Symmetry: C3
Subunit: 118 residues, 3 copies
């Protein structure tokens, strides 16, 4: 699982432990061990949301499975809550794109997660 946050919030406003908190929370939420989880936060971005440059975030979550209607709603509540609490971004100025990745289309460690066939 991989979570990316792009925001116009300044770098100094990103709490020091934010990456670890996202990692732990995403581990719990996805049921995947933390060792698999990647997080990427990009502050100070030039963005508009609804024509306004008030604090906002455009995000993506990639996962192999564990993606879908009810699950995604749960992720949104969790992640909007963290962005609101830690970065002070209103949940209605956050977008999160969810991607259900096929194991064959995720590369890692010189190979992919499609190990079953040649």
């Amino acid at each position: 699982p991989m979570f990316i946050v792009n925001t116009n919030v300044p770098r100094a406003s990103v709490p020091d432990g934010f990456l670890s908190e996202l990692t732990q929370q995403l581990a719990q939420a996805t049921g995947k061990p933390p060792q698999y989880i990647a997080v990427h936060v990009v502050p100070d971005q030039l963005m508009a949301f609804g024509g306004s440059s008030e604090p906002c975030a455009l995000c993506s979550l990639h996962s192999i499975g564990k993606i879908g209607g009810a699950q995604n709603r749960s992720y949104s509540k969790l992640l909007c809550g963290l962005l609101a609490e830690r970065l002070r971004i209103s949940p209605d100025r956050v977008y999160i794109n969810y991607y259900d990745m096929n194991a064959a289309n995720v590369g890692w460690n010189n190979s992919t997660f499609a190990l079953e066939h040649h």
Copy 2:
């Protein structure tokens, strides 16, 4: 809908009004209200296109529907036109990835748009 531009053009070369013009033109082209539209411009990037570092752009447009053959060709004309005029990037050094998003896969305001 959501549009991202990554370019090696310097931030200083990004004109006042650019984000707003993108927002307005995207609202027009996609038919979605301006309040929906998110735009994100990332200048000063380390990029090569065809092995050359002349001005170029790599872009994406996500949308719930309104993605398709003729529509995408129309978006490309619109967006390449703007990037050429405003950022002086040649249209043949722009790539735009189009994504048709399912509403259940776009999160917003503590939920998704399937709800």
Copy 3:
């Protein structure tokens, strides 16, 4: 085809020649002419892999076709090898998302690559 690398490795550590080597190696691996290949490298990123801030990279490769089981494993070996050699990033701290794009969903030069209908 376009390849993006986001990494917490500092810009100073990105070696002269890196983008060009990516460009030429990707042309070779995809069998596509270099003229088509776009590369984008983003250093100095605030990111974690497994909760650790040791060097890591999150990457993507988009291609119209030439995406699939064996091909992607080959791309991974190639690109992890280059990231390891050039940026000193361990292959097990690299993720690469592969996207098989439809020609109708890739814009270029005022249009797309779907010209048939």
